[PDB]
Design an enzyme around this catalytic site. Structure first.
Site, PDB file in Angstrom:
ATOM      1  N   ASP A   1      24.243  54.279  17.046  1.00 39.57           N
ATOM      2  CA  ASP A   1      23.014  54.830  17.617  1.00 39.57           C
ATOM      3  C   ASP A   1      23.066  56.341  17.454  1.00 39.57           C
ATOM      4  OD1 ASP A   1      21.063  55.960  19.265  1.00 39.57           O
ATOM      5  OD2 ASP A   1      21.189  54.343  20.740  1.00 39.57           O
TER       6      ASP A   1
ATOM      7  N   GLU B   1      29.599  58.086  29.547  1.00 37.10           N
ATOM      8  CA  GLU B   1      28.333  57.423  29.241  1.00 37.10           C
ATOM      9  C   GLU B   1      28.161  56.309  30.267  1.00 37.10           C
ATOM     10  OE1 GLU B   1      27.905  54.937  25.893  1.00 37.10           O
ATOM     11  OE2 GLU B   1      25.789  55.457  25.535  1.00 37.10           O
TER      12      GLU B   1
ATOM     13  N   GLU C   1      24.838  47.806  35.450  1.00 32.90           N
ATOM     14  CA  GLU C   1      26.288  47.865  35.271  1.00 32.90           C
ATOM     15  C   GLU C   1      26.974  48.556  36.445  1.00 32.90           C
ATOM     16  OE1 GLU C   1      27.577  49.216  31.338  1.00 32.90           O
ATOM     17  OE2 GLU C   1      25.669  48.607  30.511  1.00 32.90           O
TER      18      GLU C   1
ATOM     19  N   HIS D   1      19.768  52.077  21.875  1.00 36.17           N
ATOM     20  CA  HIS D   1      20.310  50.785  22.292  1.00 36.17           C
ATOM     21  C   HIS D   1      20.067  50.497  23.775  1.00 36.17           C
ATOM     22  CE1 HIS D   1      23.388  53.362  23.832  1.00 36.17           C
ATOM     23  NE2 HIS D   1      24.355  52.465  23.891  1.00 36.17           N
TER      24      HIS D   1
HETATM   25  C1  LIG Z   1      23.880  36.566  29.166  1.00 34.30           C
HETATM   26  O1  LIG Z   1      23.214  37.621  29.906  1.00 34.30           O
HETATM   27  C2  LIG Z   1      24.002  38.525  30.489  1.00 34.30           C
HETATM   28  O2  LIG Z   1      24.672  38.296  31.464  1.00 34.30           O
HETATM   29  C3  LIG Z   1      23.922  39.854  29.825  1.00 34.30           C
HETATM   30  C4  LIG Z   1      23.348  40.906  30.535  1.00 34.30           C
HETATM   31  C5  LIG Z   1      23.250  42.150  29.974  1.00 34.30           C
HETATM   32  O3  LIG Z   1      22.695  43.204  30.638  1.00 34.30           O
HETATM   33  C6  LIG Z   1      23.736  42.404  28.654  1.00 34.30           C
HETATM   34  C7  LIG Z   1      23.650  43.667  28.023  1.00 34.30           C
HETATM   35  C8  LIG Z   1      24.147  43.888  26.757  1.00 34.30           C
HETATM   36  N1  LIG Z   1      23.995  45.158  26.115  1.00 34.30           N
HETATM   37  C9  LIG Z   1      23.859  46.424  26.672  1.00 34.30           C
HETATM   38  O4  LIG Z   1      23.942  46.644  27.876  1.00 34.30           O
HETATM   39  N2  LIG Z   1      23.646  47.441  25.789  1.00 34.30           N
HETATM   40  C10 LIG Z   1      23.487  48.828  26.233  1.00 34.30           C
HETATM   41  C11 LIG Z   1      24.807  49.540  26.571  1.00 34.30           C
HETATM   42  C12 LIG Z   1      24.571  50.946  27.189  1.00 34.30           C
HETATM   43  C13 LIG Z   1      25.823  51.830  27.315  1.00 34.30           C
HETATM   44  N3  LIG Z   1      26.811  51.323  28.263  1.00 34.30           N
HETATM   45  C14 LIG Z   1      27.872  52.073  28.689  1.00 34.30           C
HETATM   46  N4  LIG Z   1      28.574  52.894  27.962  1.00 34.30           N
HETATM   47  N5  LIG Z   1      28.277  51.990  29.993  1.00 34.30           N
HETATM   48  C15 LIG Z   1      29.677  52.040  30.419  1.00 34.30           C
HETATM   49  C16 LIG Z   1      30.588  51.094  29.632  1.00 34.30           C
HETATM   50  C17 LIG Z   1      31.992  51.609  29.331  1.00 34.30           C
HETATM   51  O5  LIG Z   1      32.629  52.046  30.557  1.00 34.30           O
HETATM   52  C18 LIG Z   1      33.812  51.288  30.752  1.00 34.30           C
HETATM   53  N6  LIG Z   1      34.065  51.172  32.181  1.00 34.30           N
HETATM   54  C19 LIG Z   1      33.252  50.608  33.125  1.00 34.30           C
HETATM   55  N7  LIG Z   1      33.729  50.655  34.341  1.00 34.30           N
HETATM   56  C20 LIG Z   1      34.949  51.294  34.187  1.00 34.30           C
HETATM   57  C21 LIG Z   1      35.951  51.653  35.103  1.00 34.30           C
HETATM   58  N8  LIG Z   1      35.883  51.407  36.422  1.00 34.30           N
HETATM   59  N9  LIG Z   1      37.039  52.283  34.610  1.00 34.30           N
HETATM   60  C22 LIG Z   1      37.115  52.526  33.306  1.00 34.30           C
HETATM   61  N10 LIG Z   1      36.238  52.228  32.355  1.00 34.30           N
HETATM   62  C23 LIG Z   1      35.169  51.615  32.862  1.00 34.30           C
HETATM   63  C24 LIG Z   1      33.555  49.969  30.016  1.00 34.30           C
HETATM   64  O6  LIG Z   1      34.754  49.206  29.881  1.00 34.30           O
HETATM   65  C25 LIG Z   1      32.950  50.572  28.742  1.00 34.30           C
HETATM   66  O7  LIG Z   1      34.003  51.119  27.963  1.00 34.30           O
HETATM   67  C26 LIG Z   1      24.687  42.810  26.051  1.00 34.30           C
HETATM   68  C27 LIG Z   1      24.783  41.568  26.615  1.00 34.30           C
HETATM   69  C28 LIG Z   1      24.311  41.326  27.929  1.00 34.30           C
HETATM   70  C29 LIG Z   1      24.394  40.056  28.548  1.00 34.30           C
END
Ligand SMILES: COC(=O)c1cc(O)c2cc(NC(=O)NCCCCNC(=N)NCC[C@H]3O[C@@H](n4cnc5c(N)ncnc54)[C@H](O)[C@@H]3O)ccc2c1
Ligand SMILES: COC(=O)c1cc(O)c2cc(NC(=O)NCCCCNC(=N)NCC[C@H]3O[C@@H](n4cnc5c(N)ncnc54)[C@H](O)[C@@H]3O)ccc2c1
Ligand SMILES: COC(=O)c1cc(O)c2cc(NC(=O)NCCCCNC(=N)NCC[C@H]3O[C@@H](n4cnc5c(N)ncnc54)[C@H](O)[C@@H]3O)ccc2c1
Ligand SMILES: COC(=O)c1cc(O)c2cc(NC(=O)NCCCCNC(=N)NCC[C@H]3O[C@@H](n4cnc5c(N)ncnc54)[C@H](O)[C@@H]3O)ccc2c1
Lengths: 342, 343, 343, 343
Positions: free
Chosen positions: B31, B123, B132, B280
């Site tokens: 993206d 992010e 999320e 995205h």
């Molecule tokens: C069946 O239906 C369903 O159930 C469903 C529902 C959805 O909604 C679905 C949505 C999808 N696609 C989507 O959302 N696309 C857009 C993305 C936007 C950008 N997201 C982003 N960067 N956010 C943060 C993420 C990163 O932060 C990390 N992290 C989190 N907490 C952390 C913690 N405590 N410590 C350390 N690390 C932590 C994670 O591990 C990761 O590296 C696909 C499938 C989907 C399915």
């Protein structure tokens, strides 16, 4: 403590039964006319196998197969379903005035109590590549409720494997992985991950359909007789194969599909997901080799496909294949739990 | 930990398995708006990073930490809770930056950092900004922020606007009317039609759309990440009063968001508005159960209430009314189960 | 030793002059009507630059350019040629009754004796990408025989560079190398050589033509003025470039072509090998990047093309390019001595 | 060394540069007839290799050495004079065979081997079998062969036969007649027409063809590699007496070859005959400059004389006559400069 929970991670099961709780997924399976029409034909044309009989419907969903059993004259049908769809099945039983004949029983078939033994078990236990979802183990488990000479609809399943050539499919998955070949993506060298990316992409079974012209040899068949198999048979499935190549060229992987048969008293009815037959919601499945193999027409491609069941209600796939004449060998691991829908 | 208290195990297992895949990293990295703007925000505000200590919350592959390194950061702690942490490690080694980027596997609510930091980067935005519940982890991380440290992004703006989309509205009933037939292979399905309609209407629609469906200037709800606390995001009440610019039927509310990187040298914006190139994040639309007729010049008022749940998402309650006529509508939606309509 | 032999490996020269000793290669060059017709026009339309003048034809081959100079009224033409083709030129001079005017002189122009200084040098010193063969150095060397007022045909050369996108060309060269990705070719693991194979294939400049659609920016121009340059100027040729991208997409490499101008007293005549012009026996040349670069319309692609002359009568090519807005950098080395003929 | 005495430096430099490329190895490896037959010959004669000492002459990438290892060889000395030796080394390491395959860079006429060997394996065949004079290096290597020792291949059969191909013959003059024009841009080229004809006819045509152009059963000249000495291949005289099966014009002689791997368990053949699938050796045809008319039942008799030259090739002298009429034709060809006609 149940057979189901011992073999299934909680988080997998939660997701699985949430997914099947939706009416939209029921609609998606029901509107497959080949699937629904063939099940209806199998049951109605074998009406003597249901007349005045006691039936078990394993994973009934909306209840559709139980209604076919009722149309065929069943005295009593126990419809077992572990998702919230069981409540909707109940609504339909009431509204079709069949409360005297269809009894919904909420829960896992490995956990519920049935008041009596049954004459015949019906179900749609087939997943992608037949075995995905490990629903076949629940169907076989249910035989504890089957009277001695009872029947099962479906009665048998045939898995088919064949080698295929599809340069475009290979270069598509290969081109994706070479994203991680870049030495300066916004100034960042990603290439150290190229190998891990290729592995991840080629572990994904490709779910879609294809023209039979890509098949390079007659398919090999592995048969499960549901009247005879035990659940444990499906924890480790070893499928040997020896293909006699009908065309020269590059073999990019193996293609999978399945047939099931309803062996009734009046006639045997077949449901096929072969690529020679109209498309179904099962499509076909292809496992790619990371490096294709060269073979000549008349060579033999031999090896073993090993399916090891996992606690995510799926299988780890090991395919080992070699061109006997040259000794060209390819070994491959795939995760059926993370398919690529193309 | 704070994370596990607010999150169902089963939700978290699935969540971190999904982000464990390189293909999902690639999807986000491709993206150009997303990756290019983060790079510009960091590099054009280089004085905010030169010889500074940095925390990257949820670093995934590590890309934002590399941008911080390009900008002269002395030390970057990159926290990641998925198995992607091991791939980030590989890249740090192969880019000869082990002396400067330290990957720390685990949740940011659970790991130890040796040191307070000058700036947090992340992010944290999901669909509709809040999906999320990653924003809470980003705010939680402020316990490691020095007094007068910065956050990149610094603020988020969620935008709501009323829309008209007759075809989207009618599509719900066309799908549900599958169940409205008295003899589907001999079976009367019609008793389930209402349950099917309800199920489709609980799903927010992730999609893009032409800006000509928007019927009023958006209303803006702002989170200042320098000032907010985690608790502020458990119950998010967004009042709205729309001055209608067009007459017609209002079928629901459309959502999108912006974030700003308020740097010392300049402020850089990342927008997911429908007037901007697609990202995205797309956009999100929540339908009303019954549409509302409004004239240009009317006011459409109500509230969007977002109630955090243990599935790393929100239950959405929308109430709207046309003030001049008293016509009222509502809907309840589950952001955890969106419908992906884009083609 | 002569200037030629000090800069040229014996084995390269033996092969080079054996190749040009064949009449079939003369035919191939002569039947290019653009090439032969434009040389004739340049000479005949500037006849006053040849009338009663003394001429030197460097690398005359069959003698064709000497015959044009005779048609234009030259008093005397020294036709120098180092291959055995010199003997066939002799035959044609006698058969066309021009022995009083064309004097063939066998040998290298760096080694032969001419009896007098000349008014104008004519030659076809251009190779692929202009510089291949290092024949331009022999043409400039020959200025030692040029009178102070003297002219050169051609007078200048323009090399043009432009970025291109051609996924099919990239995947073709890439697919060839992945032969060496095989872990069991007749039971033999070849994969340890994959990297060396990719390098070898992408070091090859691609000689063929192409649709101008693939060009992603206006070309950048590097000019050699043959009246002013010295041989030494061509040992290390540095061509900086800054392209303003006109289209978004992947840049798979740089495309090269050239023009030369015959700046005569009466008019200037141009010979172009551009892809906007009819094909010539020079075609065009493309240097692939091992990894393509992503750029947006409006970005700038900047860097340097460095040509280092070698003893195989060719050049080692170094191309360094970067997308200024993202810092995506690609470095590439190519061997112009081992081109891939794709036409 | 024996190699340098018989080989001009410039020929060798070019020869070993060409074989230094992985793309040329890949082109030979992809010939399934070539690679598959060598593998079958070795593996099906495993008792000739089990726990034996092997010499691979000109091993290139090493593929034949790996077949010898698959067959149980205790020790394989793989000699290669090009830079491909370094790539062979890499493969030996990555296939975990350093204890069994020793790569030895250099000419087999110049390197040291620590011990005598049981069997020599090589691919010494060039076009027409003899091109490249690699057969002399293969025979030279017998100094390292034990008394009992074997050679894979063990013998070679060259086949000659007369052919009729009116279109191939006339194609020579169509090309040469480029020169037969009195005013090519004002220049009379016709004096060179005969020189052009001569040049085309000196080239053996490397091509395949339908066997129906053959006019008599082939004549066979055999080299037993167990018995031949290097000097036997400096002057090769192949008498022939063809008994014509078809009436018509004879336009030249066609050449192809077979080799046999005479093992203890079986004899395996590798054929390049036109009745067999195509190989990268194709077939070779040498034209007569004047065809010979013969009737079915006539005899066409003469001599094919191959004289080795210092360009790692042969000067070919073919003299033929139709005994019943006395119609004679000669021809002098240069095997070093073949014409590749295949498309
Ligand atoms: C069946 O239906 C369903 O159930 C469903 C529902 C959805 O909604 C679905 C949505 C999808 N696609 C989507 O959302 N696309 C857009 C993305 C936007 C950008 N997201 C982003 N960067 N956010 C943060 C993420 C990163 O932060 C990390 N992290 C989190 N907490 C952390 C913690 N405590 N410590 C350390 N690390 C932590 C994670 O591990 C990761 O590296 C696909 C499938 C989907 C399915
Ligand atoms: C992101 O990537 C991924 O992670 C992923 C992976 C996939 O593979 C994905 C695959 C999908 N789609 C698909 O597979 N479509 C084709 C379906 C073929 C037909 N299936 C069928 N009828 N089997 C049985 C089901 C019924 O039996 C019930 N039941 C089960 N056990 C029971 C028990 N113990 N007691 C009682 N009832 C039990 C169930 O509740 C239900 O009613 C979509 C998304 C996917 C996502
Ligand atoms: C991959 O395999 C490989 O390795 C390879 C590499 C190549 O690059 C390959 C390239 C080829 N073909 C090609 O490029 N064709 C297009 C160029 C035509 C235009 N060039 C032109 N006219 N230049 C000047 C030539 C004439 O000047 C004479 N001369 C030179 N110096 C002289 C001196 N000191 N004194 C006197 N006379 C001198 C020469 O003898 C001759 O008569 C084919 C095969 C190739 C193979
Ligand atoms: C200049 O342009 C033109 O005019 C030209 C002329 C040709 O004729 C052209 C002909 C071509 N093609 C062709 O000939 N195809 C026929 C396939 C033959 C298959 N046999 C085979 N592999 N040879 C065996 C040699 C291998 O043994 C090594 N070796 C040699 N001696 C060694 C020593 N003393 N010690 C150690 N190692 C030694 C070598 O390095 C190598 O690995 C292409 C382009 C051609 C171009």
């Amino acid at each position: 403590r149940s057979v189901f929970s011992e073999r299934t991670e909680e988080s997998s099961a939660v997701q699985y039964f949430q997914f099947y709780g939706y009416l939209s997924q029921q609609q998606n399976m029901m509107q497959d006319y080949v699937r629904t029409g063939t099940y209806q034909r199998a049951i109605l044309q074998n009406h003597t196998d249901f007349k005045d009989k006691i039936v078990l419907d394993v994973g009934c969903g909306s209840g559709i197969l139980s209604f076919f059993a009722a149309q065929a004259g069943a005295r009593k049908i126990y419809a077992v379903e572990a998702s919230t769809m069981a409540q909707h099945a109940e609504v339909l039983v009431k509204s079709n005035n069949l409360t005297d004949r269809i009894v919904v029983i909420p829960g896992k078939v490995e956990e519920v109590s049935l008041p009596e033994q049954v004459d015949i078990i019906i179900s749609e236990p087939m997943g992608y590549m037949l075995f995905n979802e490990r629903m076949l183990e629940s169907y076989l488990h249910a035989k504890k409720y089957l009277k001695p000479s009872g029947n099962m609809f479906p009665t048998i399943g045939d898995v088919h494997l064949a080698p295929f050539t599809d340069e475009q499919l290979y270069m598509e998955q290969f081109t994706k992985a070479n994203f991680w070949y870049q030495p300066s993506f916004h100034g960042v060298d990603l290439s150290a991950l190229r190998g891990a990316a290729v592995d991840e992409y080629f572990r994904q079974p490709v779910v879609d359909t294809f023209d039979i012209r890509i098949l390079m040899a007659k398919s090999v068949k592995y048969t499960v007789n549901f009247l005879e198999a035990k659940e444990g048979d499906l924890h480790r499935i070893e499928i040997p194969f020896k293909f006699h190549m009908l065309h020269s060229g590059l073999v990019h992987g193996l293609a999978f599909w399945f047939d099931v048969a309803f062996i009734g008293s009046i006639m045997t009815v077949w449901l096929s997901t072969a690529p020679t037959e109209p498309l179904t919601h099962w499509y076909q499945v292809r496992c790619l080799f990371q490096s294709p193999l060269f073979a000549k027409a008349g060579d033999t491609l031999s090896g073993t496909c090993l399916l090891i069941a996992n606690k995510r209600q799926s299988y780890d796939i090991s395919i080992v294949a070699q061109v006997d004449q040259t000794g060209s060998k390819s070994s491959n691991l795939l995760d059926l739990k993370n398919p690529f829908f193309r």
